[PDB]
Design a protein around this nucleic acid. Structure first.
Ligand SMILES: [K+]
Ligand SMILES: [Mg+2]
Ligand SMILES: [Mg+2]
Ligand SMILES: [Mg+2]
Ligand SMILES: [Mg+2]
Ligand SMILES: [Mg+2]
Ligand SMILES: [Mg+2]
Ligand SMILES: [Mg+2]
Ligand SMILES: [Mg+2]
Ligand SMILES: [Mg+2]
Ligand SMILES: [Mg+2]
Ligand SMILES: [Mg+2]
Ligand SMILES: [Mg+2]
Ligand SMILES: [Mg+2]
Ligand SMILES: [Mg+2]
Ligand SMILES: [Mg+2]
Ligand SMILES: [Mg+2]
Ligand SMILES: [Mg+2]
Ligand SMILES: [Mg+2]
Ligand SMILES: [Mg+2]
Ligand SMILES: [Mg+2]
Ligand SMILES: [Mg+2]
Ligand SMILES: [Mg+2]
Ligand SMILES: [Mg+2]
Ligand SMILES: [Mg+2]
Ligand SMILES: [Mg+2]
Ligand SMILES: [Mg+2]
Ligand SMILES: [Mg+2]
Ligand SMILES: [Mg+2]
Ligand SMILES: [Mg+2]
Ligand SMILES: [Mg+2]
Ligand SMILES: [Mg+2]
Ligand SMILES: [Mg+2]
Ligand SMILES: [Mg+2]
Ligand SMILES: [Mg+2]
Ligand SMILES: [Mg+2]
Ligand SMILES: [Mg+2]
Ligand SMILES: [Mg+2]
Ligand SMILES: [Mg+2]
Ligand SMILES: [Mg+2]
Ligand SMILES: [Mg+2]
Ligand SMILES: [Mg+2]
Ligand SMILES: [Mg+2]
Ligand SMILES: [Mg+2]
Ligand SMILES: [Mg+2]
Ligand SMILES: [Mg+2]
Ligand SMILES: [Mg+2]
Ligand SMILES: [Mg+2]
Ligand SMILES: [Mg+2]
Ligand SMILES: [Mg+2]
Ligand SMILES: [Mg+2]
Ligand SMILES: [Mg+2]
Ligand SMILES: [Mg+2]
Ligand SMILES: [Mg+2]
Ligand SMILES: [Mg+2]
Ligand SMILES: [Mg+2]
Ligand SMILES: [Mg+2]
Ligand SMILES: [Mg+2]
Ligand SMILES: [Mg+2]
Ligand SMILES: [Mg+2]
Ligand SMILES: [Mg+2]
Ligand SMILES: [Mg+2]
Ligand SMILES: [Mg+2]
Ligand SMILES: [Mg+2]
Ligand SMILES: [Mg+2]
Ligand SMILES: [Mg+2]
Ligand SMILES: [Mg+2]
Ligand SMILES: [Mg+2]
Ligand SMILES: [Mg+2]
Ligand SMILES: [Mg+2]
Ligand SMILES: [Mg+2]
Ligand SMILES: [Mg+2]
Ligand SMILES: [Mg+2]
Ligand SMILES: [Mg+2]
Ligand SMILES: [Mg+2]
Ligand SMILES: [Mg+2]
Ligand SMILES: [Mg+2]
Ligand SMILES: [Mg+2]
Ligand SMILES: [Mg+2]
Ligand SMILES: [Mg+2]
Ligand SMILES: [Mg+2]
Ligand SMILES: [Mg+2]
Ligand SMILES: [Mg+2]
Ligand SMILES: [Mg+2]
Ligand SMILES: [Mg+2]
Ligand SMILES: [Mg+2]
Ligand SMILES: [Mg+2]
Ligand SMILES: [Mg+2]
Ligand SMILES: [Mg+2]
Ligand SMILES: [Mg+2]
Ligand SMILES: [Mg+2]
Ligand SMILES: [Mg+2]
Ligand SMILES: [Mg+2]
Ligand SMILES: [Mg+2]
Ligand SMILES: [Mg+2]
Ligand SMILES: [Mg+2]
Ligand SMILES: [Mg+2]
Ligand SMILES: [Mg+2]
Ligand SMILES: [Mg+2]
Ligand SMILES: [Mg+2]
Ligand SMILES: [Mg+2]
Ligand SMILES: [Mg+2]
Ligand SMILES: [Mg+2]
Ligand SMILES: [Mg+2]
Ligand SMILES: [Mg+2]
Ligand SMILES: [Mg+2]
Ligand SMILES: [Mg+2]
Ligand SMILES: [Mg+2]
Ligand SMILES: [Mg+2]
Ligand SMILES: [Mg+2]
Ligand SMILES: [Mg+2]
Ligand SMILES: [Mg+2]
Ligand SMILES: [Mg+2]
Ligand SMILES: [Mg+2]
Ligand SMILES: [Mg+2]
Ligand SMILES: [Mg+2]
Ligand SMILES: [Mg+2]
Ligand SMILES: [Mg+2]
Ligand SMILES: [Mg+2]
Ligand SMILES: [Mg+2]
Ligand SMILES: [Mg+2]
Ligand SMILES: [Mg+2]
Ligand SMILES: [Mg+2]
Ligand SMILES: [Mg+2]
Ligand SMILES: [Mg+2]
Ligand SMILES: [Mg+2]
Ligand SMILES: [Mg+2]
Ligand SMILES: [Mg+2]
Ligand SMILES: [Mg+2]
Ligand SMILES: [Mg+2]
Ligand SMILES: [Mg+2]
Ligand SMILES: [Mg+2]
Ligand SMILES: [Mg+2]
Ligand SMILES: [Mg+2]
Ligand SMILES: [Mg+2]
Ligand SMILES: [Mg+2]
Ligand SMILES: [Mg+2]
Ligand SMILES: [Mg+2]
Ligand SMILES: [Mg+2]
Ligand SMILES: [Mg+2]
Ligand SMILES: [Mg+2]
Ligand SMILES: [Mg+2]
Ligand SMILES: [Mg+2]
Ligand SMILES: [Mg+2]
Ligand SMILES: [Mg+2]
Ligand SMILES: [Mg+2]
Ligand SMILES: [Mg+2]
Ligand SMILES: [Mg+2]
Ligand SMILES: [Mg+2]
Ligand SMILES: [Mg+2]
Ligand SMILES: [Mg+2]
Ligand SMILES: [Mg+2]
Ligand SMILES: [Mg+2]
Ligand SMILES: [Mg+2]
Ligand SMILES: [Mg+2]
Ligand SMILES: [Mg+2]
Ligand SMILES: [Mg+2]
Ligand SMILES: [Mg+2]
Ligand SMILES: [Mg+2]
Ligand SMILES: [Mg+2]
Ligand SMILES: [Mg+2]
Ligand SMILES: [Mg+2]
Ligand SMILES: [Mg+2]
Ligand SMILES: [Mg+2]
Ligand SMILES: [Mg+2]
Ligand SMILES: [Mg+2]
Ligand SMILES: [Mg+2]
Ligand SMILES: [Mg+2]
Ligand SMILES: [Mg+2]
Ligand SMILES: [Mg+2]
Ligand SMILES: [Mg+2]
Ligand SMILES: [Mg+2]
Ligand SMILES: [Mg+2]
Ligand SMILES: [Mg+2]
Ligand SMILES: [Mg+2]
Ligand SMILES: [Mg+2]
Ligand SMILES: [Mg+2]
Ligand SMILES: [Mg+2]
Ligand SMILES: [Mg+2]
Ligand SMILES: [Mg+2]
Ligand SMILES: [Mg+2]
Ligand SMILES: [Mg+2]
Ligand SMILES: [Mg+2]
Ligand SMILES: [Mg+2]
Ligand SMILES: [Mg+2]
Ligand SMILES: [Mg+2]
Ligand SMILES: [Mg+2]
Ligand SMILES: [Mg+2]
Ligand SMILES: [Mg+2]
Ligand SMILES: [Mg+2]
Ligand SMILES: [Mg+2]
Ligand SMILES: [Mg+2]
Ligand SMILES: [Mg+2]
Ligand SMILES: [Mg+2]
Ligand SMILES: [Mg+2]
Ligand SMILES: [Mg+2]
Ligand SMILES: [Mg+2]
Ligand SMILES: [Mg+2]
Ligand SMILES: [Mg+2]
Ligand SMILES: [Mg+2]
Ligand SMILES: [Mg+2]
Ligand SMILES: [Mg+2]
Ligand SMILES: [Mg+2]
Ligand SMILES: [Mg+2]
Ligand SMILES: [Mg+2]
Ligand SMILES: [Mg+2]
Ligand SMILES: [Mg+2]
Ligand SMILES: [Mg+2]
Ligand SMILES: [Mg+2]
Ligand SMILES: [Mg+2]
Ligand SMILES: [Mg+2]
Ligand SMILES: [Mg+2]
Ligand SMILES: [Mg+2]
Ligand SMILES: [Mg+2]
Ligand SMILES: [Mg+2]
Ligand SMILES: [Mg+2]
Ligand SMILES: [Mg+2]
Ligand SMILES: [Mg+2]
Ligand SMILES: [Mg+2]
Ligand SMILES: [Mg+2]
Ligand SMILES: [Mg+2]
Ligand SMILES: [Mg+2]
Ligand SMILES: [Mg+2]
Ligand SMILES: [Mg+2]
Ligand SMILES: [Mg+2]
Ligand SMILES: [Mg+2]
Ligand SMILES: [Mg+2]
Ligand SMILES: [Mg+2]
Ligand SMILES: [Mg+2]
Ligand SMILES: [Mg+2]
Ligand SMILES: [Mg+2]
Ligand SMILES: [Mg+2]
Ligand SMILES: [Mg+2]
Lengths: 48, 275
RNA sequence: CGAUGUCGGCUCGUCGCAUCCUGGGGCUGAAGAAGGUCCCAAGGGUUGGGCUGUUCGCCCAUUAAAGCGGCACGCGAGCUG
RNA sequence: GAAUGCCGGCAUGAGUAACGAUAAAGAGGGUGAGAAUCCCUCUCGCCGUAAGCCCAAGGGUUCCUACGCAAUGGUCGUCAGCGUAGGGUUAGGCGGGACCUAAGGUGAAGCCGAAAGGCGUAGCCGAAGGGCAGCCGGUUAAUAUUCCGGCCCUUCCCGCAGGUGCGAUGGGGGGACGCUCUAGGCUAGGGGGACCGGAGCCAUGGACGAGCCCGGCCAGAAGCGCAGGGUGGGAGGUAGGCAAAUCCGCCUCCCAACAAGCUCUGCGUGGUGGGGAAGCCCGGGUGACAACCCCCCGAAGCCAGGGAGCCAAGAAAAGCCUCUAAGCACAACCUGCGGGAACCCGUACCGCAAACCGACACAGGUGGGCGGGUGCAAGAGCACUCAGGCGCGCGGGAGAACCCUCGCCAAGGAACUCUGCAAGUUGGCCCCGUAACUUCGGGAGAAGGGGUGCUCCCUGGGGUGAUGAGCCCCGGGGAGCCGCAGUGAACAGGCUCUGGCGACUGUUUACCAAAAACACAGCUCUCUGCGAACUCGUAAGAGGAGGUAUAGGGAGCGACGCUUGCCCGGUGCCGGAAGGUCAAGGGGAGGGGUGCAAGCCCCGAACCGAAGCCCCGGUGAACGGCGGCCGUAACUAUAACGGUCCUAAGGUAGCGAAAUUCCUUGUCGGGUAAGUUCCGACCUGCACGAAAAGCGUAACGACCGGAGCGCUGUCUCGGCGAGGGACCCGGUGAAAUUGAACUGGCCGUGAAGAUGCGGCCUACCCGUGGCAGGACGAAAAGACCCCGUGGAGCUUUACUGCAGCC
RNA sequence: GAGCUAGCCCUGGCCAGGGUGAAGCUGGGGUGAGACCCAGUGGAGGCCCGAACCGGUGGGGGAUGCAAACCCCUCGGAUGA
RNA sequence: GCGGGGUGGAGCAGCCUGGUAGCUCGUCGGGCUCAUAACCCGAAGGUCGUCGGUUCAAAUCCGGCCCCCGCAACCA
RNA sequence: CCGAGGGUAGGGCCCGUGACUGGGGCGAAGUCGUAACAAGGUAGCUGUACCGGAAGGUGCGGCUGGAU
RNA sequence: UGGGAGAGGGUGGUGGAAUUCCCGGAGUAGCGGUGAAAUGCGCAGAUACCGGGAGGAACGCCGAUGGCGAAGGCAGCCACCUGGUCCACCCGUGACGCUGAGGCGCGAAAGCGUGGGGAGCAAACCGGAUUAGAUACCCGGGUAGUCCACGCCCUAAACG
């Protein structure tokens, strides 16, 4: 049947994107945390 | 009148539709219409604040002239009578001798081809606007400003009217469509006659589908729900109210008066309404 | 109670005898026939249908007879539900 | 040494289940160390409204070629979407950007919020909507509307010429719109040809034929033709379109008006450039100077902003045109021509799937376009088949039980069972025919029947043409032939009678309930005078609604019909400037502490003092409620009548053993040979009853009852047959479970149901196909029950707070 | 976190084929005029039959599945809420 | 299994709070009437379901037995 | 070919009968009240509507076949 | 041809009296009602009185034993549209007449549907009285309805 993951390049970027995080107090905390943990990627990889 | 159908379907049996007899023009003025933004009963938070709304036919908003004291002494002719989907009344197209074109809601007996005008000196005739103080006591009237220059607020619905009962100081006494007796300032404008399309209330939607066309989504009873949802929620099998009949928000819905007692307009309401 | 699936039906039997029938008897208020009642006897047999989820029961048409109980109220790693 | 411990490793089950659609294979020839599995050929089968083709998501090199086969591939592998390497994606015109706006998002101004932040007009962003200039062929191993070839077009800059009051983010027009139905004329596509072109072909009895087989076009500026779309023209006045305006709007006047003119598209033609089959020779060559014509069918597509009807009344903005404003009129703009300039991103490949979403090369899910022929009434249905694409990545045998999916069955025909569950029967079209009842629509495909192929002959109407031939489409009447059977295959209702419930079409527990539940039009009560009520929010601000009592919120009821009785004492809601109570506060009789005192300080009575509560009324489609005992009639029986206690008032009409009835399978009647169910009745209704509506109701229902006909493998009662498994051989090879095990029966015993204890009995060692009685078999720390001063949801006249309102 | 699912908003797209035959309109009858009746035209509808599409009624299978909801047969809606 | 009840002939007070049985109807006698009902005047009838106890004293308070109507009988 | 008739299916009229049910007629001396006939003790009758154990009552309009 | 009488019919409009309610004033101990009372209303200020408003329905005197209509029925006043009818003159047509099974229309009240309206009155209903009882007569309340529009019903002691 129709499953839960239905990839969409625009949706992904607009929801989890770098610019989405930076706009909001909660999103900046995510970036700060992922930077502090030393994550190689701070935000999902999406090709545009 | 009201148009009937033969029962060639179950719903067609009771369904009735407006006759549209007075309508003389079937598409509006391009320069007097703008897009109507459908809400669905959702506010700027995006929350439903008015339940059960959405999905209706697309509409254009016809700009309506609710001032009229806007063009005093400048007569206009009635070019057409048209369908306005945003209100129960029919609307009339006015070609002013100015060359300016405006929309009013169309009073009863208003005929295309006749002349209408607004101002203190205007004749007492159907479709004319005057401030209330210059209108003879005892004539029927619609589209009434509540306060001077603030716009026509009362009696705009199909068939409705307000009647001038008498005068007191800078104020006049109106009997509103609802039967409330109210003092309305004398400088407030009003159009003489009653709003047309009086057969409006005799329409029988006839099937669920028609409600849906009007943007009215299905209304679910409180008693049909669960206690998390509604005071009338739950029960094993069917239940009576089992408490004073209440809204989804808990307040009482049979008799509880709800207008603010200390409201400043109380000084101007002589008698609470009718039936 | 870190689980022994719980009515009835279906299938498949097996056993007990306080025996429904068939076989052998005594007594009879046993003329004959047909019964009653008790004794011995578990080898075999013990039907089809209407009603009800039913067990049971009632009813129809029969029959030598249409027995009663045990087997986790036999049987859901056999089925039904 | 134990914690259903943790991490790892290795076992058992086991050479066991399985190897992923039952569309299907066989042989010959290649290659290679090795071949059912790779390549080639021939034969066979499978899809063909797809299992073919194009595109968009998403995926991200999977593409093409060479060289490989350890692992990946459910087997094999020489093969591969796998390993290594090399190569491959080319645009002014295709898509997106340097254009426009939609919801929405953002947000100069502004408003609000402890902080973070929340809003917000304009403006900006935002597309699969508007707008915008390229079509046909060739070429590569791999790209092409991109490269090339033919023909054609757009914008920008500059120049030359002609023309004009030029000039805009400002004004106006236009852009600009729904649903259903639909005319004319075209095209896409397809059918046929005795016509044109073409390798060949004559078989096995016949055919050298008007034989067979193959093909018969695509693109194309200007011009022209056919069909359509859009559009009146002149004048005078003018106060409106936030300045101006010659534009637009309004008034008046002359002219013409399903015309014409102007303009704009579609189709046709068109200089020109292309394409070009079968067949047999090795993707190509030939065919070939290929021919490229006529007739018919014909769109849902095009002319398209076409037409009509309807009500539920159907985006915006730019491009474009026109008006003018600063300006400026050596400028500027329009028109024609000419040269020059024209950027960034995507372009490979998969794309109903082995490359996307499902952990898998997973029988599932995935939007748009094309989707050929014939026959069956039509069609995207069904069967076969073209083009194209496949045989589904384990095979070979055997011919048991049993399982699945399928076929047939004597006599019977529901006897099966909770139940006709399941499976039969019926089955399309044409004609004849069709009941109760009804809201006059229906019930209706009611029921029930007859016809259905093929051949010859005669004839009627239409379409294209021409009015005729030809082709095509609706028909009618005679006479015949064949078979068991003519919608001969495939697709395609079993019917009726009668109850309950819900009026109806809809909706629902994604993944155990589709219903009688939810919704529904309709009915009533109630609130709301507009800065409405009500809802979200601390607020600002929104929704309500750019609505205004024929409107909006809340509540119950649930089409329609006929109706909806009595109780206001309790609770609720509504009215009630009296009276009682009533907080802060006002007042301050009168006391107190301290001080030498003036003074400072602390209590403090009566009285005035809101809402609320008390109190007086109203109110049921507000919460709700609607009696008991005793006696009585000239047969008995019963009780119209009466007595008396109590109530706020004692259940009205209608209905009733009911989706409600305990006793109960009540009793009677009907149906049956037989009826705990069913239908009709009665009424001592344990425990109906009138908008948590009462009683009915045509039509409807994958709802739940009861019955009959038809027909049946449901059954008496089973039999045979098909294929896929099961079995055997070669390949690959799991699983839960598992204290260890050398693991029998009885009767006992034992924590009370023993392979394991006692006594007796029986028993050589080890497997294979089978069956499920036991191992209190597996699974899941019982979801019932209790226990815990464990938890959570829900309620209220439990307690105590809070928001909100007063 | 609304790339599943529920509602709404904006903007696009889809619904083979056959059947029934409302209003209206035209003619005719009728009448003082009417209502109204008859035929033709007409093409309405939460209308009927049935693909796509959307569903998920009953049964069978599957149950360490092809699949953590699938497969076969059957069945509902299919111009509309 | 738990609640309430039994008192002139009928229907109900008194019981709680011990001493004192009451109200309507009915019945019986007398009137009015031609006569009956209605109506008017007067009168009779209970020892309190029983047995047992507490008390100086029991319808009254407490135990048991008979009876009478109710409410309950749930989880499997 | 027609054809008595037989069979199947659906209709129409009539007759008999049916748990139960509805009122009607009649019946020597039942129960309840007393509507009507005298102004019948509320003048009566009436068409309709609603209500009530029963006669009946009441509403609206009508009639005199009523007032004395 | 010319005249007359009339509540004949339909539409629109309009007048004053009375009742109820609301507002202001003034005023206090009862009002109301009956056979007599009670319910009810009234110190929360009623009744009675004056002023102001709103609203519905019916038209006093004229008014009659009268008038008109086919019948039911028709009554303030005005205007408009319209029917019947009598008289006159003796002008026109030339028996064109009477009746009328069916049909068609009209048809008091009550009643029904949809919407409006609603002062007074009032089925049902409640209460107070009467009474043995009183599901009545009397009293205090009161819902349909009585009114309008449209559409039904189609009855009567529709009688002379
Ligand atoms: K339980
Ligand atoms: Mg999707
Ligand atoms: Mg995307
Ligand atoms: Mg996207
Ligand atoms: Mg997205
Ligand atoms: Mg972002
Ligand atoms: Mg990572
Ligand atoms: Mg890095
Ligand atoms: Mg992130
Ligand atoms: Mg209708
Ligand atoms: Mg109209
Ligand atoms: Mg616009
Ligand atoms: Mg917002
Ligand atoms: Mg928001
Ligand atoms: Mg709401
Ligand atoms: Mg809403
Ligand atoms: Mg309108
Ligand atoms: Mg709408
Ligand atoms: Mg609802
Ligand atoms: Mg619920
Ligand atoms: Mg919630
Ligand atoms: Mg919530
Ligand atoms: Mg709640
Ligand atoms: Mg409740
Ligand atoms: Mg409930
Ligand atoms: Mg219940
Ligand atoms: Mg309840
Ligand atoms: Mg309650
Ligand atoms: Mg409540
Ligand atoms: Mg509130
Ligand atoms: Mg009011
Ligand atoms: Mg246990
Ligand atoms: Mg365990
Ligand atoms: Mg276990
Ligand atoms: Mg013997
Ligand atoms: Mg003998
Ligand atoms: Mg024996
Ligand atoms: Mg039985
Ligand atoms: Mg039994
Ligand atoms: Mg057991
Ligand atoms: Mg037992
Ligand atoms: Mg058992
Ligand atoms: Mg089982
Ligand atoms: Mg069992
Ligand atoms: Mg068992
Ligand atoms: Mg088991
Ligand atoms: Mg077991
Ligand atoms: Mg240990
Ligand atoms: Mg474990
Ligand atoms: Mg081992
Ligand atoms: Mg192993
Ligand atoms: Mg092994
Ligand atoms: Mg083996
Ligand atoms: Mg094994
Ligand atoms: Mg095996
Ligand atoms: Mg396995
Ligand atoms: Mg498999
Ligand atoms: Mg396979
Ligand atoms: Mg072969
Ligand atoms: Mg191989
Ligand atoms: Mg090999
Ligand atoms: Mg193979
Ligand atoms: Mg090959
Ligand atoms: Mg095909
Ligand atoms: Mg991937
Ligand atoms: Mg390998
Ligand atoms: Mg190898
Ligand atoms: Mg290998
Ligand atoms: Mg592998
Ligand atoms: Mg391998
Ligand atoms: Mg695999
Ligand atoms: Mg090799
Ligand atoms: Mg490549
Ligand atoms: Mg190019
Ligand atoms: Mg630039
Ligand atoms: Mg923009
Ligand atoms: Mg913001
Ligand atoms: Mg954006
Ligand atoms: Mg943009
Ligand atoms: Mg775009
Ligand atoms: Mg473009
Ligand atoms: Mg081109
Ligand atoms: Mg190359
Ligand atoms: Mg110019
Ligand atoms: Mg210019
Ligand atoms: Mg528009
Ligand atoms: Mg659009
Ligand atoms: Mg073409
Ligand atoms: Mg064809
Ligand atoms: Mg001007
Ligand atoms: Mg201007
Ligand atoms: Mg001019
Ligand atoms: Mg050549
Ligand atoms: Mg059009
Ligand atoms: Mg429409
Ligand atoms: Mg806009
Ligand atoms: Mg200037
Ligand atoms: Mg110059
Ligand atoms: Mg650039
Ligand atoms: Mg490409
Ligand atoms: Mg597709
Ligand atoms: Mg693939
Ligand atoms: Mg997943
Ligand atoms: Mg595979
Ligand atoms: Mg797949
Ligand atoms: Mg067909
Ligand atoms: Mg295969
Ligand atoms: Mg074998
Ligand atoms: Mg057979
Ligand atoms: Mg049979
Ligand atoms: Mg038979
Ligand atoms: Mg049966
Ligand atoms: Mg049945
Ligand atoms: Mg069949
Ligand atoms: Mg009919
Ligand atoms: Mg038939
Ligand atoms: Mg043949
Ligand atoms: Mg068939
Ligand atoms: Mg069918
Ligand atoms: Mg029943
Ligand atoms: Mg339902
Ligand atoms: Mg339903
Ligand atoms: Mg119902
Ligand atoms: Mg109904
Ligand atoms: Mg439907
Ligand atoms: Mg539901
Ligand atoms: Mg479910
Ligand atoms: Mg569930
Ligand atoms: Mg689930
Ligand atoms: Mg669930
Ligand atoms: Mg299911
Ligand atoms: Mg259903
Ligand atoms: Mg209704
Ligand atoms: Mg809130
Ligand atoms: Mg708004
Ligand atoms: Mg509104
Ligand atoms: Mg309904
Ligand atoms: Mg409902
Ligand atoms: Mg309901
Ligand atoms: Mg009450
Ligand atoms: Mg009260
Ligand atoms: Mg009350
Ligand atoms: Mg109050
Ligand atoms: Mg107070
Ligand atoms: Mg007697
Ligand atoms: Mg009653
Ligand atoms: Mg009964
Ligand atoms: Mg039930
Ligand atoms: Mg019951
Ligand atoms: Mg029973
Ligand atoms: Mg029972
Ligand atoms: Mg029985
Ligand atoms: Mg019955
Ligand atoms: Mg009985
Ligand atoms: Mg209720
Ligand atoms: Mg109720
Ligand atoms: Mg019923
Ligand atoms: Mg029904
Ligand atoms: Mg009916
Ligand atoms: Mg029905
Ligand atoms: Mg249904
Ligand atoms: Mg259903
Ligand atoms: Mg069988
Ligand atoms: Mg086989
Ligand atoms: Mg392997
Ligand atoms: Mg061991
Ligand atoms: Mg061992
Ligand atoms: Mg024991
Ligand atoms: Mg043992
Ligand atoms: Mg042993
Ligand atoms: Mg041992
Ligand atoms: Mg031992
Ligand atoms: Mg031993
Ligand atoms: Mg032994
Ligand atoms: Mg076993
Ligand atoms: Mg087995
Ligand atoms: Mg076992
Ligand atoms: Mg488990
Ligand atoms: Mg645990
Ligand atoms: Mg446990
Ligand atoms: Mg558990
Ligand atoms: Mg327990
Ligand atoms: Mg505790
Ligand atoms: Mg404890
Ligand atoms: Mg606790
Ligand atoms: Mg809790
Ligand atoms: Mg969504
Ligand atoms: Mg999404
Ligand atoms: Mg469709
Ligand atoms: Mg169609
Ligand atoms: Mg026709
Ligand atoms: Mg149609
Ligand atoms: Mg339909
Ligand atoms: Mg249908
Ligand atoms: Mg299914
Ligand atoms: Mg589904
Ligand atoms: Mg089935
Ligand atoms: Mg499962
Ligand atoms: Mg399936
Ligand atoms: Mg279907
Ligand atoms: Mg079907
Ligand atoms: Mg259908
Ligand atoms: Mg269709
Ligand atoms: Mg729609
Ligand atoms: Mg007492
Ligand atoms: Mg005591
Ligand atoms: Mg005498
Ligand atoms: Mg007497
Ligand atoms: Mg003593
Ligand atoms: Mg004593
Ligand atoms: Mg005593
Ligand atoms: Mg005492
Ligand atoms: Mg005592
Ligand atoms: Mg319980
Ligand atoms: Mg014969
Ligand atoms: Mg009398
Ligand atoms: Mg009388
Ligand atoms: Mg009397
Ligand atoms: Mg009388
Ligand atoms: Mg009675
Ligand atoms: Mg009465
Ligand atoms: Mg009268
Ligand atoms: Mg007389
Ligand atoms: Mg006072
Ligand atoms: Mg003469
Ligand atoms: Mg006559
Ligand atoms: Mg009448
Ligand atoms: Mg009347
Ligand atoms: Mg009536
Ligand atoms: Mg008396
Ligand atoms: Mg009495
Ligand atoms: Mg009436
Ligand atoms: Mg008379």
């Amino acid at each position: 049947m129709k499953r839960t993951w239905q990839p969409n390049r625009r949706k992904r970027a607009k929801t989890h994107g770098f610019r989405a995080r930076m706009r909001t107090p909660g999103g900046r905390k995510v970036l700060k945390r992922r930077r502090q943990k030393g994550r190689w990627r701070l935000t999902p990889a999406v090709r545009k | 009148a009201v148009k009937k159908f033969k029962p060639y379907t179950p719903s067609r049996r009771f369904m009735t539709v407006a006759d549209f007899s007075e309508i003389t023009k079937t598409e509006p003025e391009k320069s007097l219409v703008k897009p109507l933004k459908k809400t669905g009963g959702r506010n700027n938070q995006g929350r439903i604040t008015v339940r059960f709304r959405g999905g209706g036919h697309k509409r254009l908003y016809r700009i309506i002239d609710f001032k009229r004291w806007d063009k005093v002494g400048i007569p206009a002719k009635v070019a057409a009578i048209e369908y306005d989907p945003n209100r129960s009344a029919r609307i009339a197209l006015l070609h002013y001798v100015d060359g300016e074109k405006r929309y009013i809601i169309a009073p009863d007996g208003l005929q295309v081809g006749q002349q209408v005008v607004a101002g203190p000196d205007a004749p007492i005739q159907v479709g004319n606007a005057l401030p209330l103080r210059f209108i003879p006591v005892g004539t029927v009237v619609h589209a009434v400003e509540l306060e001077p220059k603030k716009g026509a607020k009362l009696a705009r619905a199909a068939g409705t009217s307000a009647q001038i009962q008498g005068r007191e100081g800078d104020y006049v006494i109106l009997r509103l469509p609802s039967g409330e007796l109210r003092k309305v300032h004398g400088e407030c404008y009003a159009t003489v006659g009653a709003v047309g399309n009086a057969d409006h209330k005799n329409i029988v939607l006839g099937k669920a589908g028609r409600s849906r066309w009007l943007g009215r989504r299905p209304h679910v009873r409180g008693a049909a729900m669960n206690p998390v949802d509604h005071p009338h929620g739950g029960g094993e099998g069917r239940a009576p109210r089992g408490r004073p009949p209440a809204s989804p928000w808990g307040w009482q819905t049979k008799g509880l008066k709800t207008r603010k007692r200390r409201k400043p307009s109380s000084r101007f309401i002589i008698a609470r309404r009718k039936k």
